[PDB]
Design a protein around this ligand. Sequence first.
Ligand code: NI
Length: 268
Amino acid sequence: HHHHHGSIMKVLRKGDRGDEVCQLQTLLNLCGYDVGKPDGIFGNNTFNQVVKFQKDNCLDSDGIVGKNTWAELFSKYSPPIPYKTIPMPTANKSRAAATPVMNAVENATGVRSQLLLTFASIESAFDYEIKAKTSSATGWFQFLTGTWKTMIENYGMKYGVLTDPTGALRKDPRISALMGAELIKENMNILRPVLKREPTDTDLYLAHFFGPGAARRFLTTGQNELAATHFPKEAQANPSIFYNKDGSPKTIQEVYNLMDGKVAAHRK
Ligand code: NI
């Protein structure tokens, strides 16, 4: 039930802090129990609302947030933007069918649909069911089971999805696009601080490809420098792009230009 999911949630107490306390406060506000802007720190405002919420619902009202209190929240909260408000595309593997969807997602998350379109194209050529033969990567944005799970717990409620144990919703274009835009948001947010420029699609693809941390260093690590040197895990993971046909390491600029070209093939 919702009890099993609340069962694996972290048991929270006044004094804790982190993504969990953040998910908690969101749910409390989304339940009608105002705690304020979620900050990730379980203080007094949060404690008093938890207690009341527990009393209003006949739960052990001691301020401790366990299985039962979590399940109740997952049960009462009202999703600000249910993913069903995003329309399904009329067809699969179609860029034109995906357009209206990405427009709705842009209105919902703020991320430009041209960008969402480019990514869904490079990742799955618009097949929202495609499942990589070399990994978990599934759907339009080819989400791995790990990253998907993380994305659900941290943004899911916002769209009416608390858990996807199977990771099966990665095949649904609506939720994948929403989650995809949230991922892009985190990344463009990490990159812009260190960049006298608005992150480009290529910049964001690098973050999508090598991780936000990896890309951050890369996007600012000497043009004519040997990439494989600074990015060993990345270089060993994609030798085809980090090394020339003869085995020698390419320069940073060469890796970038190579990537920017892969992206270019999927724009407009
Ligand atoms: Ni409990």
